[model samples]
Target: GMTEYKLVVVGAVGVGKSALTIQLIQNHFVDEYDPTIEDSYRKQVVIDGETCLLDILDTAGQEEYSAMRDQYMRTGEGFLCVFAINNTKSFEDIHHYREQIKRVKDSEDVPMVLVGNKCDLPSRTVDTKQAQDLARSYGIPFIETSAKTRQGVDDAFYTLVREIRKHKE
Candidate 1:
């Protein structure tokens, strides 16, 4: 038997939000840059000897989809808000996504993980200390991931699942 969970992936454009979700569930890497409006992926994952059925929503980064984002936040049991380590602006913009989740969910204790994607890139503008500090301030986990090399991707998703499970308990 598989336990079910709802998760949402959020980030600015080109931050690899779609790539990260697909990489985790499908084990695929995307080279082309395609902006996601919305997409759903279902995966049966084994975490800590527990079978999980995860329904993940990959969402758009554009401001026009603000209402849709709120809807996603309202329904999602967990969230993975991503930023590119190489992009300073993307890191700075991650709070906007988190704020939307708090606003729509009306809770600061929502299950969420802060993901710094594209950690494979050599040029990183978002310092590790900076990201960790933000995560600390929010009392969330901060993880650096490289969708291309599959680093920290599973950890990010698994952590969110555990947090979601914890929230219910």
Candidate 2:
């Protein structure tokens, strides 16, 4: 039997949200992305040896899209809030994304995973400890990924799906 889950990927501009989502759903790395508006992807993925159908919404990060974001949050059952480790601003933007999701969904305990993308970049501005501490305070799993090299990419999705699966129980 296959269960269905709706997932949303969110973060600031150029934080590798599209790369992670495309890689997870399509198994390919994208070198360049021209600001996404909103994209929907459907895939049957087996995470943690369990099969499920994932309907993912990859969203835009522009500031003027709060209303659109609210709609996204309302539809999502799980979330992956991504930030690039080399960009401090992107890291800071995660707070806003998390808050918006909670505010829109009106749930403090939404299933979520805090992702640090582009970890392979050497300019690393946000360290593991800082990201982990934030994730810990939010009670979510923290994962670092290099979408270019495909490092920890699957783990991020697996971790997120695992969290979403908990809601099924």
Candidate 3:
């Protein structure tokens, strides 16, 4: 039997959550600005020699969609907490998102990953060390990704899947 991983991409506005999801699913980057209320994508891939299906939810980062957050949080098997490297405020909002996930899931050991997106940009306000420290404090993995260049894109999602696998053990 094949396993399915229900993953959620969450973060503050303009953090490139959709970009990363599209990059992974479609194998390319989208430079347009289309705000997402919620988008679902399904892909089949092999992770660690095991066939797995990825059911990814690309969520809206706008404040208007805040009310819809918990519903998806409740269904997610793992979460990718994304923030742009160029935005300090987005990075600061990560804890709130993670806390919400924890609250909805009612588990302290929920599977999650901290992602610093837009790493391809020249201007970076959030240092890699800062993100790494935050991830360490949350007891989760941190990855720097560029949806444009596709750096660390696979690793971020794959790491979250691995987290979910370990969490189930």
**Best model number under TM-score:** 3
Taking all chains together, each candidate's TM-score versus the true structure is: 0.93, 0.93, 0.95
Encode model 2's per-residue lDDT on 1-169: one tens digit a residue: 7888998888888898888888987789988776755688998977778788988888876546567667778888999999999999999988988888898989888999999999888979999999999999999999999898899988987888899888656
When 1 and 2 are scored with TM-score, the better candidate is 1
Off by over 4 Å in 2: 62-66
Better of 1 and 3 by lDDT: 3
Q: After superposition on all CA atoms, what RMSD does each candidate show versus the true structure? A: 1.6, 1.7, 1.6
Model 3 pairs in collision: none
Of candidate 1, the 10-residue stretch with the lowest lDDT total is 61-70
RMSD of 1: 1.6
Please, what are the lDDT tens digits per residue for candidate 3 over residues 78-123? 9999999999999999979888889888999999999999998988
How do the candidates rank by lDDT, highest first? 3, 1, 2
Off by over 4 Å in 1: 62-66
lDDT of 2 at 90: 94
Clashes of each: 0, 0, 0
User: How high a TM-score does candidate 3 get?
Assistant: 0.95
> Which portions of model 3 miss their true places by more than 4 Å?
62-67
Assess candidate 1 and give its lDDT.
0.88
